[PDB]
Amino acid sequence: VGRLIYTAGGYFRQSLSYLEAYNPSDGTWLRLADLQVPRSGLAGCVVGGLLYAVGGRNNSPDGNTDSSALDCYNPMTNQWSPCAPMSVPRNRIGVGVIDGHIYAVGGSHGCIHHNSVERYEPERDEWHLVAPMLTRRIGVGVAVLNRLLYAVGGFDGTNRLNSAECYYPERNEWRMITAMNTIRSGAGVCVLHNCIYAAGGYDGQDQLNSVERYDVETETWTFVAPMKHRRSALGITVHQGRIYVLGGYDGHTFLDSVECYDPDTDTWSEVTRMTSGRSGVGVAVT
């Protein structure tokens, strides 16, 4: 009884360790087991009903280090269990899942701007690297469609990117797709109805509120209704046919308003507010 939206970690004056869940049907908010380590800039995904916390940059009383950690949360036990860590720390990471395999895309290790991606086999609890991206990307958004991994926007070390690349697992290669109309760093990327949505983000001069979706059929970026709040480093997921944007940062305050986008109406609604404003959260639904 209840498929939930999960928010894990985040930042607000100090990277948080909170794990909270939102039930859209009734609007309730749930406080669950906190992360063993406060983390922000991490990404979230679910494989086999299990929630995974990947990457980010964790708080410590002995430093503020880029985390290569992979942690697994079981809603049934409300208990976090650490898994095998990634080869290298990845902060500002994008993660996409293909057949129960977790793809870690880009991310930063201090000044190192990763272009390498590694995949995780949950059953073996092992990470193995694959082909690296054509471009270095941190703050990149990752989305999987028809068993294809799309990495969009980000920062390559000197430029904020509007380009996107596509990973073909069968060929194990990266192909550059038509770039977005807008440069987006720390934007929200998700898939809905054969379309990759890029929501919000940072273009280099100001946090964005516009949203443009990429139509796989045409392979072209088209603008849709923009969001009511400008946000960057936002959490994003789709839940029962609607896109959900969680929190983010507008350039002034750490936001918490959650906005819902309806494809059929092409309108944004503020469905709820979170317990506390936060940014750089990982988001997943299960």
Q: Is 265 exposed, middle or buried (0-12, 13-18, 19+ CB in 10 A)?
A: exposed
Residue 115 within binding range of ligand GFD, rule CB under 6 A = no
Contacting ligand GFD (CB under 6 A), which of 8, 117, 279, 284?
Answer: 279
**3 state SS for 114-141:** CCCEEEEECCCCEEEECCCCCCCCECCE
- Residue 91 within binding range of ligand GFD, rule CB under 6 A: yes
Q: Is 40 near ligand GFD (CB under 6 A)?
A: yes
Report the residue number, 24 or 140, with the smaller CB distance to ligand GFD. 140
Among 59, 135, 185, 257, binds ligand GFD (CB under 6 A): 185
185 or 272, CB closer to ligand GFD? 185
Q: Is 53 within 8 Å of 74 (Cβ atoms)?
A: no
The answer to whether 155 contacts ligand GFD (rule: CB under 6 A) is yes
Gaps in the chain following residue numbers (C to N > 2.5 A): none
CA distances from 17 to 5, 60, 74, 81, 135 (A): 16, 11, 16, 14, 31
Q: Footprint of ligand GFD on residues 196-255 (CB under 6 A)?
A: 202, 232-233, 249
105 binds ligand GFD (CB under 6 A): no
Q: Which of 35, 104, 138, 236 binds ligand GFD (CB under 6 A)?
A: 138
Q: Quick one: 41 or 96, whose CB is closer to ligand GFD?
A: 41
Nearest to ligand GFD of 75, 280 (CB atom):
280
Measured from the CB atom, the residue of 77 and 205 that comes closer to ligand GFD is 205
Residue 150 contacts ligand GFD per CB under 6 A: no
What are the two backbone dihedrals, phi and then psi, of residue 74, each rounded to the nearest 5 degrees?
Answer: -110, 110
Instruction: Say whether residue 11 binds ligand GFD (CB under 6 A).
Output: yes
Strand partners of residue 109: 112
How far apart are CB 54 and ligand GFD at their closest, in Å? Answer: 12
Q: Do 47 and 2 contact (CB within 8 A), yes or no?
A: no
Tell whether residue 18 is a contact of ligand GFD (CB under 6 A).
Answer: no
> What is the 8-class DSSP label of residue 263?
T
Does position 133 bind ligand GFD by CB under 6 A?
no
Choose among 152, 228, 154: nearest CA to 195. Answer: 152
What is the rounded CA–CA span in Å between residue 141 and residue 212?
13
Footprint of ligand GFD on this chain (CB under 6 A)?
A: 11, 40-41, 57, 91-92, 138-139, 155, 185-186, 202, 232-233, 249, 279-280
